[PDB]
Write a protein that binds this ligand. Sequence first.
Ligand SMILES: C[S@@+](CC[C@H](N)C(=O)[O-])C[C@H]1O[C@@H](n2cnc3c(N)ncnc32)[C@H](O)[C@@H]1O
Ligand SMILES: [Cl-]
Length: 323
Amino acid sequence: ANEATQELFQVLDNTAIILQNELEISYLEAVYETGENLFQKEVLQKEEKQLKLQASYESIELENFSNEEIRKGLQLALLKGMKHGIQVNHQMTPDSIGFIVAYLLEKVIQKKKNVSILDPACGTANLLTTVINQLELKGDVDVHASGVDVDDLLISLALVGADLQRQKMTLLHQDGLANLLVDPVDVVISDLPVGYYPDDENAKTFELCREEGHSFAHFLFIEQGMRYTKPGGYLFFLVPDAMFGTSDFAKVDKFIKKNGHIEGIIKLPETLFKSQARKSILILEKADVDVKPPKEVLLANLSSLTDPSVTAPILAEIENWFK
Ligand SMILES: C[S@@+](CC[C@H](N)C(=O)[O-])C[C@H]1O[C@@H](n2cnc3c(N)ncnc32)[C@H](O)[C@@H]1O
Ligand SMILES: [Cl-]
C-alpha cells in the first residue's frame, strides 16, 4: 500500500481528531478509542458527530487491507500521537528498526516452521507485529508471539492493533518482571525501558538486583528475558549504546556469561532516533549442550541505513554469521 495505508490513516486521523475534541482526551487515547470503534463496527461512546464518525468508518472495509497496511496505518497515527510529551521509555519502535530486527531473526531461525517470540516490555506491539508480519510473509513460518506491558494505554493500543491487524497473539497487561505465564520462547525481542524499576521487593528475586536503592529496569529485563528463553534460543534487545561503557555493565556481562553469550552488538544509525541517544541491537544466545560462543563477537557500526558503502560489508557479514 501506502495507497491503502494512507486511506486507513486518514480514517483514523479524522475520527481521532473528533474523539480528541468531543471527549477531551489525548490524540493517542483517541487513537485507541477510534480503533475499537472501527474494529467492532460501532461508535462505542454514543452517550458522550456520531453520524460523521460512522460515515468515516464505513468508507473503508478493513478485510481488503493487508496486515502490514493496517499496521503501517496505525504506525502513522501512533507516531503523530507520540510527537510531544511522550517519554523515551514510552516511544514506539518504528519499522526502520523493526525490519532490522525481523531480518536478524530470519538469520537465527533458519528452517524452523514454528517460532515462538516474547516481548516482555512490548508497548504498542509495533515491533512485535512488524516482526510477526515479516517472518510469516513467505507462508512457511508460524509465529507464536507474546507481549507484556505494564502500561494501560499502551497495552490497550497493542490489543486493538492486534484486533485490527487480525493477529492471533497473546498480550498481557502486567509487570513483565513479575512471574509470566509464558512458556520459554525461541526468541526474545524488546526495546528496553531504561531507568529505575520501582518494585524493590520483586527486584530481590533477580541476581541483577541492586543492594541499595532501586534496581535498573534495563538490567532486570535482560535477566528476565534470558529466564524465559529456551536453551539455545536468542535474544535481541534495543538498548542505548552508552550502556556498554558503564562500570555497572561488567555485572550484566558476567551474568550473561554464566547463562549464555553475546553474539553481537550492532550500532544503529543516528538519524533513526529523535534527539533519544543512539541505540544498538544487543544479540545474545542462551546456553545449551551444543551451543558455543562465536570466536569473536560481531561489532558493527551501522552508521547509515541507506548508504551501501556502509551497509554492504556489515550485511554481507551478517548474511553468513549465524550459518
Ligand atoms: C521503548 S517502549 C517499547 C516500544 C515498543 N517496542 C513498541 O513497538 O511500541 C518500552 C516499554 O517498557 C514498558 N515497561 C516499563 N516497565 C515495565 C514493566 N515493569 N513491565 C512491562 N513493561 C514495562 C513501558 O510501558 C514501555 O512501553
Ligand atoms: Cl490475514
